[PDB]
């Protein structure tokens, strides 16, 4: 078996997704793609700062 | 019965509706479930607490506020108890005075 390890970063992306999921969006498939587009600027930068 | 014997024609023929049959069962705190006996006891309890605290805004010397108010309220509850032994109620009333 080839095992795995947990880096950070992914967790913050999932956190953002859950928070916008906290809006409870409709339109899910495109709403999520749009959410990643919103990440592309705003949430990526924020995450990069947030880690500390 | 005397009135009936005197003038039975007034009454003897009847067709009551079905409504209001209910025979009493006297319900008891022990027999009640938790919210019911809670409700019954608390209604009086809270009425007394409400008057006692709101009117007095109590404090007694040296005590904490909490101590003063709680103790006073507990006495007030005893003093007004619908079924507290009444000479003892008046004893507490005197202490409260």
């Amino acid at each position: 078996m080839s095992h795995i390890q947990i880096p950070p970063g992914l967790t913050e992306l999932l956190q953002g997704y859950t928070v916008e999921v906290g809006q409870q969006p409709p339109d899910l498939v495109d709403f999520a793609v749009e959410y990643f587009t919103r990440l592309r600027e705003a949430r990526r930068q924020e995450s990069d700062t947030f880690i500390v | 019965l005397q009135k009936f014997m005197r003038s039975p024609m007034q009454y003897w023929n009847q067709k009551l509706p079905r409504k209001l049959p209910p025979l009493k069962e006297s319900i008891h705190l022990t027999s009640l479930p938790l919210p019911g006996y809670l409700e019954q006891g608390t209604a009086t309890s809270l009425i007394k607490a409400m008057n006692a605290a709101g009117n007095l805004k109590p404090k007694l010397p040296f005590l904490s506020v909490r101590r003063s108010v709680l103790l006073y309220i507990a006495f007030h509850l005893k003093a007004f108890n619908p079924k507290g032994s009444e000479y003892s109620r008046k004893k507490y009333k005197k202490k409260l005075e």
């Binding site: - | 022990t30 006996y37 006891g41 309890s45 607490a49 605290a53 103790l71 309220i73 507990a74 507290g84």
Partner: protein, 48 residues
């Protein structure tokens, strides 16, 4: 005197009152009022 009545009652009385009420309910006494009053007389000498 600073504290409006709702808050004054809530903070000072209610937690202790709630707890004692809970224990009186666990008693299911013939009289809640007598039990609770005595319970408070016993507790509060220690309980603030």
């Amino acid at each position: 005197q600073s504290v409006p009545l709702r808050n004054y009652l809530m903070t000072y009385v209610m937690p202790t009152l709630m707890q004692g009420l809970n224990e009186c309910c666990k008693v299911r006494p013939e009289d809640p009022v007598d039990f609770l009053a005595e319970y408070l007389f016993k507790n509060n000498p220690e309980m603030q």
